[PDB]
Amino acid sequence: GHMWNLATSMMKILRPGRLTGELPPGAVRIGRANDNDIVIPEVLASRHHATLVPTPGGTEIRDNRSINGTFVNGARVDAALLHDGDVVTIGNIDLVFADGTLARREEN
């Protein structure tokens, strides 16, 4: 179109993605890399494999079910609502869901 005489800026200033302390960001990414907060030490785990996000009605687990798959309580799912004490199988590892946090089962 025609030239307009309003000046532009070379850059925009925005909040950087710097998270600090022992505070989680409010969502958990499941995968193989240590950016994700919770990491499964598996060959069979993708770098981003599945996501945990909060919802107004609970917490969803949302899965890249396509190649290896995710099971919740023995059932293979694309997305599901989790509550505390649900058992999730990713990478042949049985994960235990408690209050937004996943842990491996171990007979301590």
Swiss-Prot record:
Residue numbers of Phosphothreonine PTMs: T8
Entry superkingdom: Bacteria
UniProt PTM: Phosphorylated by PknF. Can probably be phosphorylated in vivo by other kinases when PknF is missing.
Disruption phenotype: Disruption results in a growth defect in macrophage and mouse infections.
Effect of T8A: Lack of phosphorylation. Attenuates growth in macrophages and in mice
Mutagenesis or variant effect for S46A: Strong decrease in phosphorylation. Decreases interaction with PknF
Disulphide connectivity of cysteines: none
UniProt domain FHA: residue ranges: 28-77
UniProt comment concerning the protein's domains: In Rv1747 the ATP-binding domain (NBD) and the transmembrane domain (TMD) are fused. The two FHA domains are required for phosphorylation by PknF.
Functional description taken from the UniProt entry: Involved in the translocation of an unknown substrate across the membrane. Transmembrane domains (TMD) form a pore in the membrane and the ATP-binding domain (NBD) is responsible for energy generation. Required for virulence.
Protein family: In the central section; belongs to the ABC transporter superfamily.
Name of the protein in question: ABC transporter ATP-binding/permease protein Rv1747
Origin species: Mycobacterium tuberculosis (strain ATCC 25618 / H37Rv)
